[PDB]
């Protein structure tokens, strides 16, 4: 992931992509994907909310109101327009920054989860991959994916190979 995303991962946001001896495989992680999705949809639900405040007419586009009260009305409306434009752009920008950052944070959560899940039986290549120093067939990879990998089974062999 360090500087590349997987365009082939078309069934999820995050996931595992491995290769051992039976070939190269790719699957999607459901937990982190659902976490990020739930947070983003939380934002959407927050920002779509309907305002129940009703405003009625105070000027007239058929018979123009008196000039002084009309300029005061226009002045106030333009001021409030500036306020809501500022609030809109600032809101969208801030929410975007927090969204990207929270996605990155979820990726880091998954990666660190796998790191502590493998213990001393692997090393960090530096680009989001875990070099496993022992035989890890598809059942071992799927044991890492479903969060059931036991590091004690491969400890002697992994450290011995390291």
């Amino acid at each position: 992931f360090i500087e590349n995303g997987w365009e082939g991962l078309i069934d999820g946001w995050y996931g595992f992509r491995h290769q051992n001896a039976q070939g190269e495989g790719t699957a999607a992680d459901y937990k982190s994907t659902q976490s990020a999705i739930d947070q983003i949809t939380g934002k959407l639900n927050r920002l779509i909310e309907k305002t129940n405040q009703q405003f009625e007419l105070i000027d007239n586009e058929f018979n123009e109101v008196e000039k002084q009260i009309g300029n005061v009305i226009n002045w106030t409306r333009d001021s409030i327009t500036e306020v809501w434009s500022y609030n809109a752009e600032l809101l969208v920008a801030m929410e975007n920054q927090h969204t990207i950052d929270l996605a990155d944070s979820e990726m880091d959560k998954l990666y660190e989860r796998v790191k502590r899940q493998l213990r001393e039986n692997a090393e960090e290549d530096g680009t989001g991959c875990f070099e496993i120093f022992h035989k890890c067939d598809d059942d071992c990879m799927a044991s890492i994916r479903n969060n059931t990998y036991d590091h004690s089974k491969y400890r002697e062999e992994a450290m011995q190979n390291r």
């Binding site: 995303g5 999820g12 405003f55 009625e56 752009e89 920008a93």
Partner: protein
């Protein structure tokens, strides 16, 4: 052996803005500023009246165009550019305040005031207000002398609001084409029309003179109004040049009034209206009309503000 972590991406991401950069590429994004307009007045499920050629204020005085709107009842009131408050040329003092009152009145409810008259005439008419023949405002009375150049007896009329809501009272001063015509109608001398209540004291005098030719007439009729409190009494002391009120108007309930030039559509439902149609949207902002009324998203200057709904899109190198 090796296992790798990663995230998704696409060759077709969308640009958004953040605190630190302008135009980063994210996977998915949605719009927050509404630009789609529905060019109709979505009035599905709303008691609507289309004033059409009848001006809103006319419904109180009742020119011919408003004959079908003398006691309307609505949740949504629509004003039209072809509307007109008058048939005989005139205008309302504090007209826009009265319009803003009637827009949210939920309709009006007329009630006879019971003004009986002694030695005058009460059937003054004109050709600008034609109902079959020369007629007048349906809710008003044009009082003048009996024959011609005859005197107008100094009269006093009173009305008590025997109801629980304020009563909209509307009278009219007649400014003739000349003092000679003012005498031909109400007699010689400077006429005075004083109006009193428990919180109102204004007084009025006619202004005879030559003016333009609006609707074929050079005279004018000033229309004045006041709100009567419950158990309060209005007093009209006059001696000529007076368009007397025949019926009071009581506000029915509550509503909302808009001005538009598009047709009514009872198929779509909307709470945010402007003159060009209806803003049916759940977005928090809109860039269609700053003077939109109802329950609307906030107007903003920007035409588009893309909210990121996905992660950053790093292309597969």
């Amino acid at each position: 052996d090796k296992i790798c972590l990663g995230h998704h991406a696409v060759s077709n991401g969308t640009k958004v803005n953040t605190l630190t950069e302008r135009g980063v590429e994210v996977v998915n994004a949605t719009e927050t500023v509404e630009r789609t307009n529905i060019p109709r007045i979505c009035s599905k499920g709303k008691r609507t009246v289309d004033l059409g050629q009848c001006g809103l204020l006319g419904t109180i005085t009742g020119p011919p165009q408003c004959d079908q709107f003398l006691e309307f009842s609505a949740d949504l009131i629509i004003e039209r550019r072809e509307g007109s408050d008058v048939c005989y040329p005139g205008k309302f003092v504090n007209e826009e305040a009265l319009r803003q009152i009637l827009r949210e009145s939920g309709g009006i409810d007329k009630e006879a005031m019971g003004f009986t008259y002694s030695g005058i005439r009460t059937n003054g008419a004109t050709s600008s207000c034609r109902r079959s023949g020369s007629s007048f405002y349906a809710e008003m009375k044009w009082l003048l002398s009996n024959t011609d150049n005859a005197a107008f007896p100094q009269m006093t009329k009173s009305y008590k609001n025997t109801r629980k809501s304020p009563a909209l009272i509307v009278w009219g001063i007649h400014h003739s084409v000349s003092t000679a015509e003012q005498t031909k109608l109400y007699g010689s001398g400077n006429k005075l029309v004083t109006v009193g209540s428990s919180n109102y004291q204004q007084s009025f005098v006619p202004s005879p003179g030559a003016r333009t030719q609006v609707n074929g007439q050079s005279g004018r009729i000033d229309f004045h109004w006041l709100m009567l409190n419950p158990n309060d009494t209005v007093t009209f002391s006059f001696n000529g040049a007076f368009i007397a009120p025949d019926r009071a108007s009581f506000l029915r309930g509550k509503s909302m009034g808009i001005q538009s030039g598009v047709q009514v559509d009872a198929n779509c439902e909307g709470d945010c209206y402007h003159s060009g149609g209806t803003i049916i949207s759940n977005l928090p902002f809109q860039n269609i009309d700053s003077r939109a009324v109802g329950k609307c998203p906030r107007y903003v200057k920007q035409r588009s503000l893309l909210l990121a709904t996905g992660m950053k899109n790093v292309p597969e190198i």
